[PDB]
Design a protein around this ligand. Sequence first.
Ligand SMILES: [Cl-]
Ligand SMILES: [Cl-]
Length: 90
Amino acid sequence: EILSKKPAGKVVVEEVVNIMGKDVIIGTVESGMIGVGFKVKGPSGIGGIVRIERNREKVEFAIAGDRIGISIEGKIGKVKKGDVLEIYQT
Ligand SMILES: [Cl-]
Ligand SMILES: [Cl-]
């Protein structure tokens, strides 16, 4: 469940791949910011950010303009290239 009203950040999806059951999203933070543990509001589900990578490095958070890879726990539904995902700190 998402307990906040406004997103901490938004991510535009560049590529989506499913690998051994987990959704990995490649994309760029469009605004605000995201951190490990934040929640992803998808089309039909809410996911948790479990890991973020930027330039092949593990990072705890990312901000607008960062291009990143994201691992999500939870089934969030069908995400496609071009989707903009809302990310909530709680
Ligand atoms: Cl592209
Ligand atoms: Cl921005």
